[PDB]
């Protein structure tokens with residue numbers, strides 16, 4: 001038996017509300033952050049055209065064996081869809097459009113929990129927009145109808161580069177966290193419980209096909225969910241776990257059926273999972289708002305405790321924006337300035353601590369020029385930028401300032417503090433942000 005979780009919130013914005021996606025996301029945040037995910041239906045006439053040749057775009061999908069708590073060939077879009085439809089109609093012995101969504105959901109959770117069944121499916125997942133092309137129109141002759149949607153904020157190609165996005169002036173290739181990803185689904189293909197890199201937002205648009213079923217958990221319950229999954233499946237790596245099991249342990253869970261033409265938004269640190277009802281085509285991108293900035297700093301601290309790799313350096317992003325203060329949105333400048341003040345005070349305290357450990361020598365270093373795998377802390381794997389410690393006895397190795405004692409057997413007077421900026425360089429950068437924000 002499966003008891004469906006309660007429905008997440010659904011918004012139907014007016015044209016005035018819809019005109020600015022970041023203003024609308026900030027508007028709904030008080031409600032939606034209490035449920036982790038939400039759904040947005042655009043105005044009825046917002047109808048971006050989709051054009052793909054089903055025969056000229058190829059992919060190799062991942063094979064999925066349906067098993068709860070458990071951690072190939074080439075298709076065209078046409079041949080995948082023929083495989084997908086025949087699978088679903090043979091599975092239920094019905095036409096695909098007659099299979100109720102409540103029954104597919106019930107059957108999915110039965111399937112993953114029975115070991116007597118060996119059902120396997122395929123999922124065209126994490127296809128890069130760069131090779132395959134986007135489902136939204138982009139500049140590359142386009143029709144006037146496609147030109148109408150080129151500059152829409154809800155065209156997911158635009159959202160990362162708008163002024164309210166805090167990566168808009170970041171030119172580093174912060175790994176496809178600025179380019180959309182595509183997902184070609186079939187019946188029962190799924191995504192496991194997870195949160196986004198650096199606790200970012202995500203936004204997902206279903207271009208066409210049968211619905212995508214979601215489950216979501218609010219950001220405030222993240223550690224509660226993690227404690228529950230540690231007790232029940234310590235081997236974890238992500239997995240499928242029945243939402244009724246989380247609910248039994250007092251974790252709040254919400255559901256929705258996302259249909260063609262609808263958006264789903266996930267909020268910072270919000271766990272989510274789901275599965276596809278049938279053949280469909282989705283597109284998604286990550287993004288970061290000013291709301292997110294202090295959570296982004298908390299996230300990198302949490303990664304350090306766990307010894308987890310970073311996708312980018314948060315401090316490097318902050319300093320890059322400071323160096324472009326004159327072209328930032330004024331509310332962006334204000335919020336970056338507050339995060340930078342915390343950064344500088346934490347950095348000041350860390351440098352005093354390592355000096356009292358006996359590190360005396362020092363030298364400026366342009367960390368941003370090193371490949372990422374050449375500037376990770378030996379102990380905690382954090383990506384260094386503000387500063388690190390090196391030792392002549394172990395060339396090329398770095399520790400962050402929390403892990404001075406983990407580098408060398410040599411005494412600390414043989415160490416060197418490598419630093420990007422003096423404290424005296426940092427305070428004028430923060431003042432430029434203040435001037436920008438106060439005007």
Ligand SMILES: *CCC(=O)N1CCN(CCc2cnn(-c3nccc4c(=O)[nH]cnc34)c2)CC1
Nearest residue numbers: 125126175176177183190191196204212272282
């Ligand atoms: C830069 C590193 C890289 O290349 N990666 C590959 C893509 N990875 C994204 C994984 C991810 C995150 N969230 N989902 C997900 N969320 C919601 C809905 C989804 C769906 O419908 N189907 C699949 N995945 C979904 C996937 C980042 C790392």
Ligand SMILES: [Mn+2]
Nearest residue numbers: 194195196202
């Ligand atoms: Mn996700």
Ligand SMILES: [Mn+2]
Nearest residue numbers: 304305379380
């Ligand atoms: Mn440690």
Ligand SMILES: [Zn+2]
Nearest residue numbers: 377380400403
């Ligand atoms: Zn470290």
